[PDB]
């Protein structure tokens, strides 16, 4: 709860890549794509819709951890 509430570009990229890989590996879609044959485009649509079932686990340098949802974080 102490870190920045904004979702960084690195987190955006990693989440989009992981979701695109999962979709290319026959993962279920939660946005009802309309003729999108590109897993990266599908992942971007899911990110814009705020329906990606991924939780970022931010680790502090000391060892503590904190969970942040994609729908909970702020996007740009």
């Amino acid at each position: 709860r102490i870190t920045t509430p904004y979702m960084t570009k690195y987190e955006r990229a990693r989440v989009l890549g992981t979701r695109a890989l999962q979709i290319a590996m026959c993962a279920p879609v939660m946005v009802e794509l309309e003729g999108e044959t590109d897993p990266l485009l599908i992942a971007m649509k899911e990110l814009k819709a705020r329906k990606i079932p991924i939780i970022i686990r931010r680790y502090l340098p000391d060892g503590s951890y904190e969970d942040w949802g994609v729908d909970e974080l702020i996007i740009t």
């Binding site: 570009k9 955006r12 990229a13 990693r14 989009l16 890549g17 695109a20 890989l21």
Partner: protein
């Protein structure tokens, strides 16, 4: 570049995660400014300013 015979390299990632990271972090629309002083490098050039 100056379009006077320069040979440039073109690479194609072989992974969806690498593709997404290249598109997001190394995006042209997202890297319109340099981290040195924040000045924009992708702007008008000769034959456009005139």
């Amino acid at each position: 570049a100056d379009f006077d015979g320069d040979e440039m390299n073109l690479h194609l990632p072989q992974t969806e995660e690498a593709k997404a990271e290249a598109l997001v972090l190394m995006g042209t629309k997202a890297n319109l400014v340099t981290p040195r002083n924040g000045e924009p490098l992708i702007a008008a050039i000769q034959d456009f300013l005139t």
